Each structure stands twice: as structure tokens, then as C-alpha cells.
Amino acid sequence: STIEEQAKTFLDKFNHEAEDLFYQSSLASWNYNTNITEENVQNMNNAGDKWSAFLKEQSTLAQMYPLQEIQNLTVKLQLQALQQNGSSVLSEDKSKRLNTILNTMSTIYSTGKVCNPDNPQECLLLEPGLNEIMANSLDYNERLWAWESWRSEVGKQLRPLYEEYVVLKNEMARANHYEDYGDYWRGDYEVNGVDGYDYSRGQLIEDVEHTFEEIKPLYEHLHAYVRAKLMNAYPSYISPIGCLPAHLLGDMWGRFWTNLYSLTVPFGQKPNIDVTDAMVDQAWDAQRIFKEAEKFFVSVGLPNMTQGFWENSMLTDPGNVQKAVCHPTAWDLGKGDFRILMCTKVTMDDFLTAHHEMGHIQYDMAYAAQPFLLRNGANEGFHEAVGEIMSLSAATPKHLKSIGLLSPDFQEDNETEINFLLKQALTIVGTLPFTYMLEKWRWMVFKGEIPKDQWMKKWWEMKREIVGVVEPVPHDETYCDPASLFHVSNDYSFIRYYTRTLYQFQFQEALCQAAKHEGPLHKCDISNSTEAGQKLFNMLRLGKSEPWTLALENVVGAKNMNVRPLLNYFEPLFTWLKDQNKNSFVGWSTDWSP
Amino acid sequence: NLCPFHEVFNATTFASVYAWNRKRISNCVADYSVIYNFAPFFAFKCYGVSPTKLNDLCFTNVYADSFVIRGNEVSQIAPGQTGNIADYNYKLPDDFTGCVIAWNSNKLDSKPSGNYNYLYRLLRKSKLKPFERDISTEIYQAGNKPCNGVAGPNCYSPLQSYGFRPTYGVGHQPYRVVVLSFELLHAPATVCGPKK
Ligand SMILES: *[C@@H]1O[C@H](CO)[C@@H](O)[C@H](O)[C@H]1NC(C)=O
Ligand SMILES: *[C@@H]1O[C@H](CO)[C@@H](O)[C@H](O)[C@H]1NC(C)=O
Ligand SMILES: *[C@@H]1O[C@H](CO)[C@@H](O)[C@H](O)[C@H]1NC(C)=O
Ligand SMILES: *[C@@H]1O[C@H](CO)[C@@H](O)[C@H](O)[C@H]1NC(C)=O
């Protein structure tokens, strides 16, 4: 009985009560999310405590089979996933302190309410109020007030906890045989053992920087166009030669530029594409939406879904009788149970999100044959990229005309193409510099080579050079501006949104080439292409067994992120921008002084 | 004389796959039409015997093994398969003149709290042999150190449970399987089909 054989029999008695306990916990979470009561909260607490205790016990009984004495690769990956100490390396007091820090930060961010104007009677909260008044605001003074009000109260509470949180996380990562918490996070895009298909945790930084260097000129042109469009609407607020203000990007943190479309749309006289009217006058419901999504998937070639999916998934809100969060997510409860939880309205955006979550479900069903610890995407961007492939494909005018929402009388022109491409670039390209900036700042902070007394100083000097966003007012060191973000405050990796953007366009170009499609990449339809479906499924059914480097090559032919699929996707928009904004300055000045 | 072809198919409970129930049937009229009463039959493979010519032959003995497995483990109930059921729980010979019948039982079996009464063996020292039954629950020692009885690390009990919740998929739902294995020993046949 070799150590590898012992490892194979442990990870076969794990993969069996893990799956059972994970199904129990997932069912508890699902029934809570569909029915918010106190019994459901207690059931989640019990199931999660049992699952966590089982995971901890299984990890301590796995620390036995040494990795250097194992020659297999699947067993090696399973034991690597199971042997992660996590937060157990810290002392008891330090671990409880870190847990309290995380809980307090999450509660402060979720319950954060700014009441600066007038008396504290009038205060708004995140989803309807603050998001509504930041999304659609035409007042520079009001936008400045809201932005500086959140950045002041929330950041001043976050920073004293944030510094000690960073110290604790760095200590835990160092005890985990890593270099820092940034290295611990980057250790997900790591392949060690496979010849020809391998990766390093610094190679991720190098590749991300190189890809950003490649994408930069398109971002500069888009930024110049956005600045030119914003100056006309906002006189004397944006200098013709300077950078772009922080509070003017629709979102509170300027993550997405999608909401900056009313002041940016070039062809206002030309109406945008929208199928809501025909979709609502054709008597379409959530059942028909998901049936048409599954029709698209089976036309592509992927298998149809289980009968229990329809009878168990919650697709419509059951009135106000019971309370249920309707955030769209795809549930993989375990033993053959796939469910979709979303409040489906009859809208184009809800149709697209249904396609996105249905692609997530298809990915989940693809690798259901893999062992429990290998039932995930190859890296943490593969799932979102796979879903976004179908989300992009289902929104094409050709697919809409074939489906029936778009009348044949509508024609396709370069004007509508440019409109759609500009909206897509505002959604997608506009967030890549911000994501790279945020993750670079977090990596540098966790590295510790930079000092601590100029965190905000370096944050704002990196915002200007990388994103082109200038601080509207000076900020001292008492602020903790990056901690105002959901992922930064709640300890979430953010490079996944940069990686998924490249991966999705890689996949789209590969599948459009495999579908024998001729023409622009943005007018592509993977539907009715069994070859494209099979090519996608080849990578889709691998799960986490094969390295992401090989999984990428199995569908694309490359071995790392490539900007070129993005650039050929956005080439018509790039040419239009270059031809249009030639009379205006491109880029942001480095000599700006407020 | 009508022997329990109905009773083996229509039973309140079915034995686990690791310890299956085998019923020896003899001194009978065939009356195979009783089997076809159940409509939802998920599989009616008939290795070695035509599925319409059963009511013409005579066999010395007929064995009706019955057990409960998953939906995705029904494919392993066949001559020459491999997995965890076909080599540690229920192996059937390469020739296997007989029929395999399986239908879904997500209503009779299964329970929202978890039907843990149906167990299988996930670990055994050696592969099973055609029509062998291993009931012993000793502790499997997986390496280099005696378990010395009930034990925890590198030890590991052998029988694992299924759980069978009714919200499971189709390949994870309980599937009652009845396997008919006709024996053709060179003895006067006691089971025959009716004929005028
Ligand atoms: C949802 O919760 C309510 C709250 O009492 C209760 O009727 C039951 O637990 C659940 N009902 C349904 C229909 O899910
Ligand atoms: C690792 O073990 C599995 C057991 O199912 C086997 O399929 C696989 O081929 C092994 N790896 C290698 C590289 O042989
Ligand atoms: C799935 O789609 C196929 C189309 O090939 C259809 O025949 C089948 O009935 C569908 N099943 C369900 C459960 O929708
Ligand atoms: C796919 O093919 C079917 C049948 O040929 C057709 O009805 C449908 O409109 C096609 N869809 C697309 C997007 O080409």
C-alpha cells in the first residue's frame, strides 16, 4: 500500500460524505434564499457549521499524504485543495480577531448610511437611493457631496480596521508558506508540475501588465471620446486637457461606465435595439424565456437540462407572501440538482441574464462527472467567461430576428453597429483599467515594500496614471477610499474580472472561427453550430482536473490571455473613434493641478 | 402453481445492493406477463434471451435478485462492466443468460430527511466474483498499520450510504433493480411456459 494508494482511498471516502454534506448545506442555503425565515437561518447555521467542521477534520487528516511522494496529477490537485491550512495557521486570538474584523467591515459597509446634509432624518441606502442618485445625476455639486460624503465617513471607519486586517492576512499568508496575501490570491492562476503547460504567481502579474499595455491605446481613445462628450454636457467642470473626475463615472467608485451612455450615445436620432415591447406584446413569461434559452443551448449542441430543474427552480417572485432575495445566481446543489434563482421580468436585460445564468448551469452540468474537489472552473474567470459567451451571443440582432423578437423590417447598419459596440465598450473596456488598478494597489499593499503613511497618496497617484481619474478634492491619510468597494471591504479577489474579459473574447473568437462565420466578430451567432458546441464542451467538461493553461488551448489554441480577440472584437469601434476624435486631444495630461 | 413473480417485484422494501436479496424460483408456470405490469421500466436488457421468446423455454431454476442502486449505476448491472457496484457489490457472470429489469422508485424509496437505510461498499480488498454476497462490515485497513478494530486514520469502514433525497437528479435517484438469471443445469426443468 503506497502513499499514493492511501491518498486515493482517503480522497474517495472524502468525495462521498463531502458531496452529501455539501448537498445538505446547499439545500439549506437555497431554501433560505427562497424563504427568509428564522428556521431557515438556523438550518443554514447548522448545515454550514457541520460542513465547515467536516472540512477542517478532513484537511487535518489529509495533511498526512505528503505531496512530494505522489506521482499522479489528479490526486495531487485534490490533495492540494484539501491540505490548505487557511486561517488555522494563525493563533486562536488572532483568528478570532480576524473574523471579527471581517464581520465588522462587512456590517459597516452593508449598513453604511451617510447623513451629512441637513438633519439626520434624511438618509439613503445602497440599492435604491444612493445607487439611483449616483447613476442618474446631472449636478456636479450633488455628485461631489455624495462621493466625498461616502469616502469620508465610511473610509475613516474602515482604515483603522483595514490596516490590522492587512497585517493579520499577511501573517496568515506567510504562515501558509507564501510571500504575502497578494501571492496567496495569485496562487489560483498557478500550475506546477505539468511540462509545457505551467504558470507562476509572478507570471500572472507580468502577463496582466503586458495585456494592459496592449489594451491601453483603445482605452485612451475611449477615454478621450468620453471626456469630449462629458465636457459638452458639463461646462467648466472638466478641463479640455486634463484627466477625468472620479465622481462623474456613473458608479460610486467608477467601476463601470455603462451608466454613462445617455451623455455618450453618438447617434441619438437612431433608436437603440430593444425587444421589450414586442416581447411583452407577444405574451412572454419566465417559462418561455428559459424555454427559449434552452432552445438556444440545444441548438448550439449542449444537452438539455434535467426535468427537476423546471419544477425546483424559482424563476418568478411568489408575491409578497414570502420574502426572498432574487439576485440572479445558478445553484449547483450537488447530486444532480441544478436550480436557477432569479426574479425574471419580461425585459431584454432579464433575458440576457437568464442566458448568462443558464450558461453557468450548463458549465456546472458539464463537469458533474469530475471528483468533488475538482468540480469548478479551471480558474476563477472561466465560469463568468463561459456565461458571458452565451450572454453576448443571445443579444445579437440576427439571433433576435431568428427568435422572433425583432421584426424582419428592421435593418442592420454601421450606425447601429457602432452604437452597440460603444455600449459594449462602456460596459467591458471601461472596467479593465479600474480592475487592474485596484488589484495592483492591493498586491502592492500586501507586498509591504511600499510604506504605510502614503496609502491614499499612492492610490491617487496610480489612479491618475493607470485609469486617468483625478481626485476632485485633496485627500489626507485618514481616508481609506479603496475600502469603500464591496470586494475590497469583504475580502474578495478582483483580478477575476480582468481575466474573464480576455477569456470571454478568446472563447468567442475561437467558437466563431469554429462555426465557419464570416464577417465582424460582434455580429456572430454560435447558435446552430454543433461544431462550436462540441469545441466548447471539450473544455467545459474538464472542470478543474486539467490545468487552465491546457483548458484554454483545448478551445482556443493559445496558452495565456490574449488582447487580440478583444482588439478584433472592438476594431470597428476603434476605427470609428480614431476617425472621429482626431481633432481632440487623446490621453490625459500629467501636469494637471487643481 | 404461480410462484412469487409478483411478490418480488411488488415489495414494501428492497434490500441494499451490498447485501442483495436472491430468491430461488422453481416448480412454476412462467406467466412472464406479470413482469410487464409495471410500465415505467427504465431498462429491460435481455442478455442471452429474447424479450419476446421467454414464454417458450424451460429452465431448472430462476433466480430473481433485487436491490436498490442509483440511476447512473444501472449501466453497471450488465456482463462485463466495471465500477463500484459491478465489482464490489453485485457482479454478474460474463455469459449471464437472463434479463435485467430496473425502474425508478423515487416515491417508494427516498425521503426529504435522507434515506440512509440503503448502503453500498466503496472499499474491498479484492474484486467480487459472479453472484457473490459480501455482508461483513469489518474496517478496511488502507495502509501499513493494523486498525485494531473500530478505527479512524487510514482505517475506514467499508459500507457507504446513498441518502436518496427526492430532490436529487435522475441519475442519483433510487432505482429498484430486479435481475432474472435463468439457470440451465442438465437436470429436469421445473419452470416452463404455458402452452395449449
Ligand atoms: C416559507 O416560510 C413561511 C413562514 O412561516 C412558512 O409558510 C413556510 O416555512 C414556508 N412556506 C413555503 C410555502 O415555502
Ligand atoms: C491518476 O489516477 C486516476 C484514477 O482514476 C487515473 O485515471 C489517472 O490516469 C491517473 N493519472 C495519471 C497521470 O496516470
Ligand atoms: C430537451 O430538449 C430536447 C430537444 O432535443 C427535447 O426532445 C426534450 O424533450 C427536452 N427535455 C426537457 C426536459 O425539456
Ligand atoms: C436554427 O435552425 C433552426 C432550424 O433550422 C431555425 O428554425 C432557427 O431559426 C435557426 N436559428 C438561428 C439563430 O440560426
Author numbering:
A (entry chain A): 19 to 612
B (entry chain B): 334 to 529
Text lifted from the article:
Since late 2022, XBB* variants, especially XBB.1.5 and other XBB derivatives with a proline on residue 486 (486P) on the receptor-binding domain (RBD) of the virus Spike glycoprotein (S) started to dominate, which demonstrated enhanced binding to human ACE2 while maintaining extremely strong capability of evading humoral immunity. Interestingly, L455 and F456 are two adjacent residues on the receptor-binding motif (RBM) of SARS-CoV-2 RBD, and the variant is just the “flipping” of the two residues, L455-F456 to F455-L456, also known as the “FLip” mutant. These two sites are also located on a critical epitope that targeted by the public IGHV3-53/3-66 Class 1 NAbs. L455F caused strong affinity reduction on XBB.1.5, but significantly improved the hACE2-binding affinity of XBB.1.5+F456L. Both L455 and F456 are on the core of the RBD-hACE2 interface, forming a compact conformation with D30 and K31 on ACE2.
As we expected, all three spike trimers mainly showed two ‘RBD-open’ and one ‘RBD-closed’ conformations with one or two ACE2 bound. To further reveal the impacts of mutations of residues 455 and 456 on the interface, we determined the high-resolution structures of these three variants’ RBD in complex with ACE2 at resolution of 3.3 Å, 3.0 Å, and 3.0 Å, respectively. Compared to XBB.1.5, F456L mutation does not substantially affect the interactions on the RBD-ACE2 interface. Although the side chain size of leucine is smaller than phenylalanine, which should slightly weaken the hydrophobic packing, the packing among RBD-L455, RBD-F456, RBD-Y489, and ACE2-F28/D30/K31 is largely kept in L456 mutant, which is in line with the slightly reduced ACE2-binding affinity of F456L. In contrast, the distances between Q493 and H34 in XBB.1.5 and XBB.1.5+F456L are only 4.78 Å and 4.86 Å, respectively, indicating very weak interactions. Our structural analyses show that in the Q493 background (XBB.1.5), F456L provides a space for insertion of the side chain of K31 into the RBD, consequently introducing a hydrogen bond between K31 of ACE2 and backbone of S490 of RBD to compensate for the dampened hydrophobic packing, which cannot be achieved in the background of R493 (BA.2) due to the steric clash between ACE2-K31 and RBD-R493, making the co-occurrence of F456L and R493 deleterious. Consistent with DMS results, L455F significantly dampens hACE2-binding affinity of XBB.1.5 RBD, and F456L also slightly weakens the binding to hACE2.
